[PDB]
C-alpha cells in the first residue's frame, strides 16, 4: 500500500529546486519515499520571488 | 514547506460555515494554519440538510 | 440504484440558499432525495443580483 | 461580444459576499456587466479569516 | 468533520481487490472509516501484473 | 438523438457488477439502451462494503 | 429553477448542425428551453461521417 | 511575452463564425493577434438561436 | 482492441472541416478507422485564419 | 525515455479483464512494456455487454 | 480585490526563467503584483528551443 | 496535419532538461518536430532523484 502526502516545497531558485525542498522534508520524516507527482506550481512575489512546487509525495507503508 | 490536509466541514447553516468547521478542527490540532482551498461542496439531505464544504487546509511545517 | 438530476437553483440572497432552491424543487417532485453535489455557481447581474448554484441532486430509485 | 475579467473578491463574512466584492469592483469600472462565474473559493487564515471567491466577470463590449 | 487519506491499494487480481487493499489498511489504523472515492487506477507490469487503485479514504474525526 | 441518464449502480462484489446494476435498471425502464460511460467509482463502508459505479447510460430517442 | 438534459445531436453536415439536432429534439418535448452548453463533440466514421455534438440543454421549470 | 484576453463571440450561423466574431473584435482593438484557443461553446435559445464560442485570444506584447 | 492517434487537422473554412482533414489523413494511412473524439480546437491567425481541430482518431487493431 | 500508446481493451467479463486485453496487445507488439494508466471505462450494450477499459500503456524506448 | 492577467513568458533557458519573463513584464506595467500561478508549459521547437510558461499573474487593485 | 506522440523524458538535473530528453528522442526519429506541450511532471526517488517531464510532441505530417 502507498500513501501520499500533499506538500508544497519552496525555492528562491527554480521549480525543480522547490520540488526537491518538499521531497527533502518528506525524507526527513518518512521511510520508503518512492516518488512524487507535481500537482501545481506558483511564485510568491515579494522582496524576492519564491518558486513553489506542490507535489504528492508517495511512500510505501510498513 | 507547506502541508495540506483534506477535510470536510459540516454545517446546518451554510457552505461558508461548513468551511469554517473544517478550519476550526485544523486549528484545534495543528500549528501555523495559513490558508484553505475549497475543493468540493455538497448537502446531506435527511431529517435536516447538512451543508458540507471540503477544503485543503494548508499549514506551515516546523 | 441512485439517479441524479442536474438542477440550477436561484436566490437573491446566497449561494447556499440557491442550492436549497434546487433541492426544494427536487423534493417537491421526487421521492427519496438523499444528497446534492455542487457542480457550479454563478451570478446573474441585472436589476438585482441572482445567485445561482447548480447541483446534481441524487435520489434513490423505486 | 462578451469579455471576462478574472477577479478575486474578499469578505470577512461569506463566500457570497466575497463574490459580490469582485462584482462591485467590476461595476465601478466597467459598463454592461452581465454575469459572473465562480471559478475558485478559498480562505486566508490570519488574525481573522478572509473568505475569497474568484469569479470570471462577463461584460458586453461597446 | 471528515478527513481523507490518499492511499494506493494493490492486487494481483482486480481493480476492486486493489481498492479493498487500501481500505483494509485504512481500517487497520483508523477508526470510523466511512467511504472511499476512486481517484486513479493503474497496472504495474513486471514478472506479474499488479492492479492498483488509488482511493481517497474518508473517516470521521473524534 | 441520444440521451443520457446519470445512474449510480451498487454491488457487494465489484465495480463491474455495480456498473451492470445501473445498466440493468436503465434497461428495465428504457428502450434502446446503447452504451454506458463510467464517470465515478466509490465504496460505501459499513457492515459490509458496497461498491458503487456511476455511469452515464446512453439510449437512442424515439 | 433550471433543469438540464444531456443530449447528443447528430448531423451529416457539421458540429453546429449536430448541436441544433439536439436542441430541436429538446424543443419538441420540453417547454421553456433557454440555452445549451456544448460538452463534447465527435464523429462516427462509417459509410458516411456523422458529426455529433453533445449538449446540456437547459430549460426553466414550471 | 504573449497575453490572452477571454472573449465570447456570437453568430446566428455557426460555432466557427462565433469564434471569428471574437477574433474580429480582438483585431479591431489589439495589435499582433497571433492565435485563439476555444475554451467553451454554447447556444442562446430565444427568438433565434445564437451560437457562442468562447476563445482565449493570444497577442504578442510590445 | 482499439488504438487512438492524436491528430490536429486544419482548414481555412471551419472547425468541422478541420476535423475532417485529420480523419482524411488517418484513413489514408490506417485501416478500420471507426470514430474520432474532439479534444481541442483553435485558430492560427496570420495572413489568413486557419481553423484547427484536434481529434483522437480510433481504429480497430488487426 | 518512455512512450505511451492509447489503447482500449475489451472484455465480456470485467473492467480489469478489459485493461488486460489492451496490455496483452501492447506486449504482443512492443518491447519493454512497464505500466498502464486507466483513462476511461465504458460498456458497449448490444446482444451482450462488452466492458471497455482505455489505458495509456507506457513502454521504455530502445 | 485581486485581478489576474494571463501571460505567457518565454526563455531559451528554462521553464522557471520563462515564468520570470512573464512576471517581469507584469511588474513593468502593473502595481502591486503579488503572485503567479502556472497554468501551462510548452516548448517552441525551431532553430532553437524556446521554453514557455503560462502564468496567471495576480495583482491587488487600487 | 500535425500528429502528437506522448513521451516522458528524464533527467537527473531538472524538469526543463527532462522535457529536452523527450524532445531529443523525438527529433532523432521524426521529421518536422514543431512543438511540445507539458502534460505532467514527476520525480522517481531512488539512489538518485530522476526528474521526469511528460510532453505531447507535435510534428507536421508528410
Ligand atoms: C500560488 C500562490 C497563490 C496565492 N494565492 C493567494 C490567494 O488566493 N489569496 C491571497 O490572499 N493570497 C495568495 N497568495 C499569497 C500572496 C503573497 C505574496 N507575498 C509575499 O510573499 O510577501 C498566493 C501565493 C501563491 C504562491
Ligand atoms: C456530497 C455527498 C455525496 C454522497 N455520496 C454518496 C454516494 O455516492 N453514495 C452513497 O451511498 N451515499 C452518498 N452520500 C450519503 C447520503 C446520506 C444522506 N442522508 C442522511 O444524511 O441521513 C453522499 C452525501 C453527500 C453529502
Ligand atoms: C452563470 C451564468 C452564465 C451565463 N452565461 C451566458 C452566456 O454564456 N451567454 C449569454 O448570452 N448569456 C449568459 N448568461 C445570461 C446573462 C443574463 C444576466 N441578465 C439578467 O439577469 O437580466 C449567463 C448567466 C449566468 C448566471
Ligand atoms: C486560496 C489561497 C491560496 C494561497 N496559496 C498560497 C500559496 O500557495 N503559497 C503561499 O505562500 N501563500 C499562499 N496563500 C497566502 C497565505 C496568507 C494567509 N495569511 C494571512 O492572511 O495573514 C494563499 C491564500 C489563499 C487564500
Ligand atoms: C500507474 C503507474 C504509473 C507509473 N508511472 C511511472 C512513471 O511515471 N515513471 C516511472 O519511472 N515509473 C513509473 N511506474 C513504475 C514502473 C514499474 C513497473 N515495474 C515493475 O513492477 O517491476 C508507474 C507504475 C504505475 C503502476
Ligand atoms: C462515494 C461516496 C461518497 C460519499 N460521500 C459522502 C459525503 O461527502 N458526505 C457524507 O456525509 N457522506 C458521504 N457518503 C456516505 C457514507 C455512508 C457509508 N455508510 C454506510 O454505508 O452505512 C459517501 C458515500 C460514498 C460511497
Ligand atoms: C464519439 C464516439 C465515441 C465512440 N466510442 C466508442 C467506444 O468507446 N467503443 C466502441 O465500441 N464504440 C465507440 N463508438 C462507436 C463506433 C461506431 C462507428 N461506426 C459506424 O457509425 O457505423 C464511438 C462513436 C463516437 C461517435
Ligand atoms: C452558454 C450559456 C449559458 C447560460 N447560462 C445561464 C445561466 O447559468 N443562468 C442564467 O440565468 N442564464 C444563462 N444563460 C442565458 C439564457 C438566455 C437565452 N435567452 C435569450 O437569448 O433571449 C446562458 C446562456 C448561454 C449561451
Ligand atoms: C491553438 C494554437 C496555439 C498556439 N500556441 C502557441 C504558443 O503557445 N506559443 C507559440 O509560440 N505559438 C503558438 N501558436 C502559433 C502561432 C502562429 C500563428 N501564426 C501564423 O499562422 O502565421 C499557436 C497556434 C495555435 C493554433
Ligand atoms: C464508451 C462508449 C461510448 C460510445 N459512444 C458513442 C457515441 O458517442 N456515439 C455513437 O454513435 N456511438 C457510441 N458508442 C457505440 C454504441 C454501440 C453499442 N452497440 C453495440 O455494441 O452493438 C459508444 C460505445 C462505448 C462503449
Ligand atoms: C505550446 C505550443 C503550442 C503550439 N500549438 C500550435 C498549434 O496548435 N497549432 C499551430 O499551428 N502551431 C502551434 N504552435 C507553434 C509552432 C511554432 C514552432 N516554430 C518555431 O518556433 O519557429 C505551438 C507552439 C507552442 C509552444
Ligand atoms: C511520476 C511517477 C509515478 C509513479 N507511480 C507509480 C505507481 O503509481 N505505482 C507504482 O508502483 N510505482 C510508481 N512509480 C515508480 C516508483 C519507482 C521509484 N524508484 C526508483 O526509481 O528506483 C512512479 C514513478 C513516478 C516518477
Ligand atoms: Cl482566464
Ligand atoms: Cl489530496
Ligand atoms: Cl450530467
Ligand atoms: Cl494521448
Ligand atoms: Mg538566489
Ligand atoms: Mg496551488
Ligand atoms: Mg439552524
Ligand atoms: Mg465530494
Ligand atoms: Mg433580498
Ligand atoms: Mg454553469
Ligand atoms: Mg465580521
Ligand atoms: Mg485560487
Ligand atoms: Mg493470482
Ligand atoms: Mg496515479
Ligand atoms: Mg458477497
Ligand atoms: Mg461521486
Ligand atoms: Mg450531406
Ligand atoms: Mg462523448
Ligand atoms: Mg441566418
Ligand atoms: Mg461558458
Ligand atoms: Mg476559403
Ligand atoms: Mg491544443
Ligand atoms: Mg462470459
Ligand atoms: Mg472514452
Ligand atoms: Mg542559451
Ligand atoms: Mg497552452
Ligand atoms: Mg547531476
Ligand atoms: Mg504521469
Ligand atoms: Na491528501
Ligand atoms: Na444529467
Ligand atoms: Na483571463
Ligand atoms: Na496519444
PDB file of C-alpha atoms and ligand atoms in Angstrom, chain F residues 4 35 37, chain G residues 8 39-42 52 54, chain I residues 37, chain J residues 40, ligand 30:
ATOM      1  CA  UNK F   4     -28.005  10.061 -21.134  1.00  0.00           C
ATOM      2  CA  UNK F  35     -23.815   2.339 -24.115  1.00  0.00           C
ATOM      3  CA  UNK F  37     -19.637   5.675 -19.711  1.00  0.00           C
TER       4      UNK F  37
ATOM      5  CA  UNK G   8     -26.236  14.094 -28.242  1.00  0.00           C
ATOM      6  CA  UNK G  39     -19.856  19.288 -23.526  1.00  0.00           C
ATOM      7  CA  UNK G  40     -18.411  17.036 -26.202  1.00  0.00           C
ATOM      8  CA  UNK G  41     -18.047  16.582 -29.911  1.00  0.00           C
ATOM      9  CA  UNK G  42     -17.238  13.545 -32.005  1.00  0.00           C
ATOM     10  CA  UNK G  52     -22.059  14.517 -33.087  1.00  0.00           C
ATOM     11  CA  UNK G  54     -23.323  16.587 -27.020  1.00  0.00           C
TER      12      UNK G  54
ATOM     13  CA  UNK I  37     -13.276  12.441 -30.418  1.00  0.00           C
TER      14      UNK I  37
ATOM     15  CA  UNK J  40     -11.573   5.734 -19.245  1.00  0.00           C
TER      16      UNK J  40
HETATM   17 MG1  LIG M  30     -18.563  11.686 -25.570  1.00  0.00          MG
END
